[PDB]
Design a protein around this ligand. Structure first.
Ligand SMILES: [Zn+2]
Ligand SMILES: [Zn+2]
Lengths: 35, 87, 626, 589
């Protein structure tokens, strides 16, 4: 499980997600929604 | 010279002074007939010497001497292969 | 771990370090001061030098010439090479060039010594070094002189000669100037590297050049093997120079800091000496005299040219011409101009709006600076008498400076101003001593002084420091200045010429990479801290180690716990024998036995094979591998 | 452990290049271009995708600009100043020098030739330039503690660079735009064997090689001579900083034969600035110029004109070089709209004309247009789309991919019809994955980062001391003090609970024979079939291979059958196990 602990350590220290990626569907997002 | 080089290498300090003397000796050429005695002395001091740089310089010098004129090096390859095995 | 130092000259080092699996050459360097023992090469055969009286000894006479007591050699100047025979240069894998000053002697190493490795340097360094070898070969081969002088090199003859000729060392190793074919061949074996560029050498070590701030393309090198780092600090400057300042930060965490290229004449402040040089030439020009400034075509000439451009306008000397005579003059000016991105933030900001970085383009535009390739061309038509001339080699042994010294040397009005400190201005001036010319020594060395290097050392904190032995003692001229020393908390070991230093930086724990496939099968434990066991196959490629997927044990098993816990874990009919400092347990099935020693255990089987594996596994309940 | 790439611009189009890369939690912007042809609200990339109404500096730690073209750096001032990104922006020195003037020219166009209600100003352009950090060629800068980027040579324009983005073992290479065939003033692109996890390449030209260099120059000059033979004028537009220099020098050398001046209608200030920038950045140019600039200055053009006058002059052989390229707006459209003729109004397009009106229809007849008071042309009127843009073709793209040797490839800055063909070619030829992301599509890849570990020198040397010629490496890894340090068992003991476990079993031998048979004959059972066991000879008589000893004592000390001590450890368990097995009952009388 040596590949488990280091991967968990790396993933634990990460940064905020993009809003579009959170709102994406099928890994694709509509751009310029206001138009 | 043979005896002069022998006594100079004996009296010189092992790490640096012997290296400097070998450096000086390598420049000047050696007559073909006298090659056997000087390489024998160099081999003896190679056995005595513990420093790696001095032994490296002795190897380089006694390889240089084998290119001197029509000297026949077939008499100095058994000791050479021996010290190579022991190195 | 090792360091072969092939040159005793401090500012022209040649060091090879047999560190890890590669032997890296740090700089080449060419001790040009040997030329001062020879008679100068004039552009036109002078009557004074030709008719010099030969020196007398009991024996020869035509080889040596005497001028005002000093004894010289009537032969082509020769250059003291680094020690090439100490270490077979065929084994050298890489050469790192820091400065164009240290770039010389490279043709010797690359051509004559059977070197088949690689050379790494920055592009301005390569171009300016090319210019320097161009002008050196041009000067030497312009009016060739024979090499008839060989008797004075004899060991028993050199002792009786006077001091400048007697104290010369490694005289038998001196060589004449390399030909231009060798220069072109050598520069073809070069790889251009930018600052902070990580160059991998056979997957073993990584070298990066770091800006030193001393010259255009000047670089310090750091060699590292991912655990042990060796920093090479060549000529560097922390002043307000044109190149981007020293990258001092990258030198931190250095096991060994080999330190060369420190300033000569440490007592001199370069700004004050620049001011003194300008004032002296202004005074000479105002009285109608000429000024001669022996200098390299691309070194400190630019800085003093800028200061002169600023000074003449206030001094009211715009009328006088500024001549710059060298075969590589226009090439020097153009190369200085185009390397704008190799400058500091103040001067590289001139690339945003359209403007050349250096101001001597304005000197040319207003026809203040006039550069020529030689004396015989348009210079002899445009020559005006109250002038200032930058030309020739600073050694005063070849180039147009010889002609100008022979021309203007008879009058007290003219002056010669020395700005390069690498040549003893009394010794370079020796073949012309009975002149009436006003000789001024105001060297301009922007390199690190001992206060600056002390501050840098305290900032960086290297574990061990390597420097020439000249810096571990005060200079002989002073001999009492403890401030002109390298003071370190470690003793700061030193070297002389042809000395081999066994560095103590030998360390274990080389890096290795483990792939996810094997890391999946590796599981850790707990001890007293985490620990695991690895059994795998080692794959090495290009000195990079990879762990591919295909005695000791530790724990807490005291005699009490041994007797109690595993008493009835599956077997029966077990007796305990009252042995000292432990207990002996054996079973009656086939006299199978278990014996424990202090902090140790082992299992005995007697005519039984099937139960032995389970016997071992029972003890492995709480036995790790720490 | 994933690399997530979301091109929200130039996904399946050319223009508005802006690619987001999340590699190890480090979110980098790969370009900040703008689109040409779009009137409003689509010129700039969609920055609402990055959690609008918030601070972009928190999300992005690095912004990279490939070169100074507007489809790669045009939206930079709007992005930075307006949306509030105060982080670093990386771009090469010529890119830094030439970027603000292009923005100033487009700002002039927007405030004069169009509306400027939602555009930026010169002061706001200068504000953006403050955050810029110049990066030299192959300068491995450390933008963050673990994130580092390296600029390579692209050869598209002066200062164009391919930016590697290496963090840990994971690395991403973004080529922006590039040309593998050197120009008359720019070299060829080069990149070492980076072998990254992903390689993002432009694909504006997935077509075959464009008939070398000499043939294209010959055809272009032949067309120029044909147009001017009948006294017609030529109206080639160009951005005045890219292929303008090559066309200028080529046409000047062609005019060395007849020696009639040619008007360069890019602004005299802009022409002087271009010459100065090209002479200050000689290292970025070709070795052709790098070696011959001292001998002569090729940029000192002997033919030039200022502006409006000779355009409305008599129908002569004058060839105009319009200041704005792509025929989207400006002097180019102003001249083109007022020009017509069989030999005259020769319109040669070196650029691509991605979506701009008028220019884009090179593949069409160029006689239809869409404008008020539109004009018509004739067949002799040049509408030739000469392939003079500094873009790598399909052969160049395959060459670059084979040179870098990436784990995966991604395509941007091209057309979908060309990019699908290029993807098919890459997958069928090099057996390497390729991707086809659209604008706003998120492409995610898995990573396999190796574990950085330190192995002791002694164990490493002993690895090949006995494993040089069937081998194995056994050791213990100590994850102590939050670092991984692989060592042998002895150094594991030395680190810091010791309790050794061994096997030294005394199997009651079934063989009942003489003392000599029991002691001096049994112990020679190693060399029968067993392997991977070291050999050391001793006169006395014993088998000492690692933790193995068999000559124990007298043959029968215990009052029973013969007793002999068999000893082994877990690494050499095979020999001891086989010996104990065949000594329990396998040696009968
Ligand atoms: Zn583009
Ligand atoms: Zn482009």
């Amino acid at each position: 499980s040596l590949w488990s602990n280091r991967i968990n350590t790396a993933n634990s220290r990460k940064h905020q997600e993009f809003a579009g990626r959170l709102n994406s569907v099928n890994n694709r997002a509509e751009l310029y929604q206001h138009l | 010279k043979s005896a002069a080089l022998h006594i100079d290498l004996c009296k010189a300090t092992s790490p640096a002074d012997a290296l400097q003397y070998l450096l000086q000796f390598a420049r000047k050429p050696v007559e073909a007939e006298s090659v056997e005695g000087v390489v024998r002395i160099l081999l003896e001091h190679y056995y005595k010497e513990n420093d790696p740089s001095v032994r490296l310089k002795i190897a380089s010098l006694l390889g240089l001497l084998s290119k001197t004129a029509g000297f026949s090096p077939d008499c100095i390859m058994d000791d050479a292969i021996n010290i190579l095995q022991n190195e | 771990m090792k360091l072969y130092c092939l040159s005793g000259h401090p500012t022209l080092p040649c060091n090879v370090l047999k560190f890890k699996s590669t032997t890296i050459m740090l700089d080449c360097g060419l001790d040009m001061t040997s030329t001062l023992n020879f008679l100068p090469l004039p552009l036109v055969q002078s009557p004074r030098l030709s008719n010099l009286p030969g020196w007398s000894l009991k024996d020869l006479d035509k080889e040596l010439k005497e001028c005002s007591g000093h004894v010289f050699v009537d032969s082509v100047p020769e250059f003291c090479l680094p020690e090439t025979e100490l270490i077979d240069l065929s084994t050298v894998d890489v050469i790192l060039i820091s400065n164009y000053h240290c770039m010389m002697a490279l043709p010797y190493i690359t051509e004559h010594t059977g070197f088949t490795g690689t050379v790494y340097a920055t592009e301005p360094t390569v171009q300016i070094g090319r210019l320097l070898m161009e002008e050196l070969v041009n000067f030497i081969e312009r009016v060739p002189k024979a090499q008839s002088a060989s008797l004075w090199k004899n060991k028993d003859i050199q002792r009786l000669l006077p001091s400048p000729l007697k104290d010369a060392v490694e005289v038998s190793t001196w060589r004449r100037c390399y030909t231009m074919q060798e220069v072109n061949s050598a520069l073809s074996k070069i790889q251009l590297v930018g600052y902070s560029q990580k160059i991998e050498l056979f997957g073993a070590v990584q070298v990066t050049p770091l800006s030193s701030g001393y010259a255009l393309g000047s670089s310090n090198w750091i060699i590292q093997s991912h655990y042990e780092k060796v920093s090479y600090v060549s000529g560097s400057s922390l002043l307000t120079t044109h190149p981007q300042p020293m990258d001092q930060a990258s030198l931190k965490n250095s096991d060994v800091l080999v330190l060369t290229g420190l300033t000569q004449i440490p007592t001199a402040n370069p700004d004050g000496m620049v001011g003194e040089f300008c004032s002296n030439l202004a005074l000479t020009v105002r009285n109608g005299g000429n000024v001669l400034v022996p200098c390299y075509p691309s070194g400190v000439i630019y800085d003093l040219l800028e200061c002169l451009y600023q000074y003449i306008d206030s001094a009211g000397l715009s009328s006088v011409p500024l001549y710059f005579i060298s075969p590589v003059a226009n090439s020097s000016l153009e190369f200085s101009q185009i390397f704008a991105e190799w400058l500091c933030h103040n001067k590289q900001s001139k690339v945003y709006l359209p403007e050349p970085p250096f101001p001597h383009a304005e000197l040319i535009q207003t026809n203040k600076l006039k550069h020529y390739p030689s004396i015989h061309g348009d210079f002899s038509n445009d020559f005006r008498q109250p002038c200032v001339v930058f030309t020739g080699h600073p050694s005063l042994r070849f180039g147009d400076v010889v002609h100008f010294m022979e021309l203007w040397g008879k009058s007290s009005l003219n002056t010669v101003i020395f700005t390069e400190p690498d040549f003893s201005y009394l010794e370079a001036l020796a073949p012309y001593q009975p002149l009436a010319m006003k000789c001024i020594y105001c060297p301009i060395d922007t390199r690190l002084n001992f206060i600056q290097v002390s501050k840098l050392l305290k900032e960086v904190q290297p574990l061990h420091v390597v420097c020439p032995e000249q810096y571990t003692q005060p200079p002989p001229a002073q001999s009492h200045r403890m401030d002109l020393m390298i003071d370190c908390q470690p003793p700061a070991m030193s070297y002389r010429r042809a000395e081999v230093l066994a560095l103590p930086f030998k360390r274990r724990y080389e890096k290795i990479e483990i792939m996810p496939e094997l890391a999946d099968s590796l599981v850790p434990m707990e001890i007293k801290i985490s620990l695991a066991t690895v059994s795998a196959v080692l794959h090495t490629k290009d000195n990079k180690h990879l762990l591919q997927p295909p005695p000791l044990l530790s724990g807490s098993i005291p005699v009490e716990q041994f007797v109690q816990t595993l008493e009835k874990h599956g077997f029966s009919d077990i007796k305990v024998e009252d042995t000292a400092k432990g207990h002996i347990v054996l079973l009656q099935e086939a006299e199978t036995l278990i014996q424990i020693e202090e902090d140790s255990t082992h299992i005995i089987c007697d005519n039984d094979e099937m139960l032995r594996v389970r016997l071992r596994d029972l003890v492995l309940k709480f036995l790790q591998k720490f | 452990p994933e690399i997530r790439v979301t091109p929200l611009g130039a996904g399946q189009d050319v223009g508005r290049s802006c690619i987001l890369v999340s590699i190890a939690g480090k979110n980098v912007m790969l370009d900040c271009g703008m689109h040409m042809g779009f009137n409003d609200d689509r010129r700039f990339p969609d920055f609402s995708y990055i959690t609008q109404n918030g601070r972009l500096t928190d999300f992005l730690d690095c912004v990279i600009i490939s070169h100074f073209h507007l489809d790669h750096c045009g939206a930079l001032p709007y992005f930075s100043e307006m949306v509030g990104y105060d982080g670093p922006i990386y771009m090469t020195h010529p890119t830094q020098a030439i970027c603000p003037i292009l923005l100033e020219d487009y700002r002039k166009i927007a405030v004069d030739k169009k509306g400027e209600a939602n555009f930026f100003t010169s002061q706001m352009i200068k504000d953006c330039m403050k955050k810029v950090v110049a990066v030299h060629l192959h300068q491995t800068v450390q933008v963050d503690d673990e994130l580092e980027i390296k600029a390579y040579y692209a050869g598209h324009v002066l200062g164009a660079a391919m930016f590697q983005i290496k963090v840990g073992s994971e690395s991403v290479v973004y080529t922006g735009d590039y040309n593998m065939t050197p120009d008359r003033h720019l070299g060829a692109a080069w990149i070492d064997k980076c072998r990254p996890n992903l390689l993002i390449t432009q694909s504006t030209y997935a077509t075959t090689i464009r008939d070398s260099k000499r043939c294209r120059e010959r055809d272009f000059l032949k067309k120029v001579h044909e147009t001017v033979e009948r006294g017609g004028k030529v109206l080639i537009p160009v951005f005045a900083l890219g292929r303008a220099q090559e066309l200028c020098i080529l046409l000047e050398t062609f005019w060395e034969r007849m020696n009639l001046k040619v008007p360069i209608y890019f602004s005299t200030g802009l022409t002087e600035k271009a010459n100065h920038y090209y002479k200050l950045f000689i290292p970025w140019t070709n070795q052709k110029i790098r070696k011959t600039f001292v001998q002569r200055n090729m940029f000192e053009f002997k033919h030039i004109k200022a502006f409006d006058r000779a355009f409305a002059d008599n129908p002569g052989p004058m060839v105009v070089f319009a200041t704005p390229g792509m025929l989207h707006a400006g002097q180019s459209l102003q001249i083109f709209r007022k020009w017509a003729g069989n030999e005259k109004n020769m319109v040669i397009m070196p650029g691509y004309c991605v979506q701009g009106t008028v220019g884009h229809k090179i593949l069409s007849g160029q006689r239809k247009l869409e404008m008020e008071g539109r004009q018509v042309l004739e067949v002799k009127m040049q509408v030739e789309y000469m392939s003079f843009s500094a873009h790598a073709d399909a052969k160049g793209i395959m060459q670059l991919v084979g040179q870098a040797e990436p784990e995966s490839v991604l395509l941007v800055h091209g057309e979908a019809k060309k990019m699908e063909f290029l993807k098919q070619k890459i997958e069928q030829e090099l057996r390497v994955n390729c991707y086809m992301p659209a604008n706003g599509e998120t492409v995610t890849l898995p990573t396999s980062p190796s574990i950085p570990v330190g192995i002791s020198l002694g164990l490493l040397k002993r690895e090949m001391a006995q494993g040089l010629l069937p081998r194995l490496l056994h050791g213990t890894l100590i994850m102590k003090d939050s670092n991984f340090r692989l060592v042998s068992s002895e150094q594991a003991l030395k680190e810091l609970a010791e309790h050794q476990l061994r096997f030294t079993c005394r199997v009651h031998l079934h063989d009942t024979r003489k003392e000599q048979e029991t002691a001096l004959r049994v112990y020679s059972h190693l060399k029968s079939v067993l392997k991977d066991h070291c050999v050391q000879h001793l006169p006395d008589g014993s088998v000492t291979v690692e933790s193995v000893l068999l000559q124990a004592a007298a043959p029968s000390e215990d009052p029973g059958t013969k007793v002999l001590l068999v000893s082994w450890t877990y690494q050499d368990e095979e020999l001891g196990s086989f010996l104990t097995s065949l000594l329990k009952k396998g040696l009968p009388q």
